Design a protein around this ligand. Structure first.
Ligand code: HEM
Ligand code: FES
Lengths: 106, 401
């Protein structure tokens, strides 16, 4: 299954991600450095911040309470489509998801 | 020696585990620790050893506690109460500032960047050892490898290794000459001048990146930089040393697991993840910031809790047959790097170190075993480990690449 990451500067990358792997884990394993994934993915750090594409929001399982809390601490502009992408888990349904990466994580 | 049972602690919760001298240690560190996970033993116990402290014994509780620094603070991470660094004793938010910095130097872009130096370093270590038929792995490889990486990262001269090897052992494992604070002070006295140098004449090595970095809105202080670099050196040298040794200890006793990785190098990354779970070796913890109830148990302000990282993976609820190593295991579940905001900064680097050591070792010395007549001595503690690992092989079975 496919995930597209677009950078703040317009750079595009695509990965083929196994079902059940986090968008963070895929990005951190594959040279997409504008996703940091500092805490390794228990939603404890806020360095895996992405803006999910508006054509996919309504297909990604909702943010839980821990995520929402940690979402308050993002450093780039928080948008309604902001998510912590260590909490977005690859599935059949997510084929072709586009996520935009903000210009900062630290 | 056992501290008097404080009045708020129920008696049926009493289980006197000594984390520095557990009962069945000649059976192996992990088995000795697995005693906290017999069916009869509860989730949360109070040991009277080491001045009295709680222990979490299941992965589920170890994770919640690590996810919860407002109740369980890192201000006092070590047991017993009686060591700077930065950022070990810090919580969020201040801790994020130093994490940011450490990530400029051991972060995944740096780790991806270094793969090839790392392999080259592994290869010459192994190549000097191959012809000899024998080595003490922990001293001849597990220590020089991560130390040589640190020297490359901080752009330190190769002639300095012996000196840091010494200062480092006196901290990690006192050979008994020097006090720990003394060893710490002497590490600081080597770093101080270099950090002054790299501030006034900055390079592109790890120390210049740290020493010229920003914390909060302003330049790091020499002293903050010093405290961080010592953690960068210490935290990655001792865990790595002991962990590589447990790994090689296992493979030395396990021809078929060796065979699998030799005949099929693709599985090595999955192998390394399995070895991380099975030979998990860290058990630090937290202090309670307030009185708080937690899984049927009332905990008092100032109480310390051991949250043994090593145990989660070994917990039969998290992994079927926890004491079996199986490189194929469907979901390798563990917290060998910790969990929550403090999750090892060196996690990316640690993995390459392991994967590279395995890859390069097995393609050169596929057959080796423990030296005849040795039995390996283990130590337990914050970082459990292996005293020495004497290995032998037939040079005739080895190969150069
Ligand atoms: C087998 C290898 C390793 C293991 C098992 C391991 C384990 C751990 C664990 C469990 C923690 C967190 C402790 C806590 O939550 O309080 C930690 C922290 C840390 N590790 Fe490692 N580690 C390893 C390798 C490394 C390496 C290669 C480095 C690089 C120098 C390193 C640097 C650090 C640092 C600087 C911290 C403090 C992080 C913090 O508290 O924010 N570690 N390590
Ligand atoms: S990786 Fe830390 S919150 Fe997502």
């Amino acid at each position: 299954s496919k995930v597209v990451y677009v950078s703040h500067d317009g750079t595009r990358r695509e990965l083929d991600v196994a079902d059940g792997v986090s968008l963070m884990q895929a990005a951190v394993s594959n040279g997409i450095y504008d996703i940091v994934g500092d805490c390794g993915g228990s939603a404890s750090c806020a360095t895996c911040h992405v803006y999910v594409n508006e054509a996919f929001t309504d297909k990604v399982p909702a943010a839980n309470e821990r995520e929402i809390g940690m979402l308050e601490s993002v450093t780039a502009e928080l948008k309604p489509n902001s998510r912590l992408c260590c909490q977005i888990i690859m599935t059949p349904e997510l084929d072709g998801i586009v996520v935009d990466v903000p210009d900062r994580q630290w | 020696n056992l501290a008097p049972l404080p009045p708020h602690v129920p008696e049926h919760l009493v289980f006197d585990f000594d984390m520095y001298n557990p009962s069945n240690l000649s059976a192996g560190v992990q088995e000795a620790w697995a005693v906290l996970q017999e069916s009869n033993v509860p989730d949360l116990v109070w040991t009277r050893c080491n001045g009295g402290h709680w222990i979490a014994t299941r992965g589920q509780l170890i994770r919640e506690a690590y996810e919860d620094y407002r109740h369980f603070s890192s201000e006092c991470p070590f047991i017993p109460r009686e060591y700077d660094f930065i950022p070990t004793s810090m919580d969020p938010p201040e801790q994020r500032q130093f994490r940011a910095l450490a990530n400029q130097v051991v972060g995944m872009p740096v780790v991806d960047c270094l793969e090839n130096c790392i392999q080259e370093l592994a290869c010459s270590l192994i190549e000097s050892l191959r012809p000899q038929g024998q080595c003490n792995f922990t001293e001849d490889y597990a220590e020089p490898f991560p130390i040589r990486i640190f020297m490359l990262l901080a752009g330190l001269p190769e002639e300095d290794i012996p000196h840091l090897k010494y200062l480092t052992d006196q901290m990690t494992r006192p050979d008994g000459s020097m006090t720990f604070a003394e060893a710490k002070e002497a590490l600081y006295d080597y770093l101080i001048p270099i950090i002054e140098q790299r501030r006034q004449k900055p390079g592109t090595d790890a120390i210049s990146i740290v020493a010229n970095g920003q914390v909060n809105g302003r330049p790091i202080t020499s002293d903050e930089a010093k405290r961080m670099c010592g953690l960068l050196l210490v935290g990655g040298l001792d865990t790595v040393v002991n962990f590589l040794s447990f790994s090689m200890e296992f493979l030395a006793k396990s021809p078929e697991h060796r065979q699998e990785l030799i005949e099929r190098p693709e599985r090595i990354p999955a192998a390394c993840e399995e070895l991380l779970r099975r030979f998990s070796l860290v058990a630090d913890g937290r202090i309670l910031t307030s009185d708080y109830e937690f899984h049927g148990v009332q905990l008092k302000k100032g109480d310390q809790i051991l949250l043994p990282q090593m145990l989660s993976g070994l917990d039969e609820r998290e992994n079927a047959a926890p004491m079996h190593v199986d490189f194929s295991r469907q979901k390798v579940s563990h917290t060998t790097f910790g969990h929550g905001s403090h999750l090892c900064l060196g996690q990316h680097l640690a993995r390459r170190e392991i994967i590279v050591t395995l890859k390069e070792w097995l393609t050169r010395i596929p057959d080796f075993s423990i030296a005849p007549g040795a039995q390996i001595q283990h130590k337990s503690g914050i970082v459990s480990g292996v005293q020495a690992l004497p290995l032998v092989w037939d040079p005739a079975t080895t190969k150069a690449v």
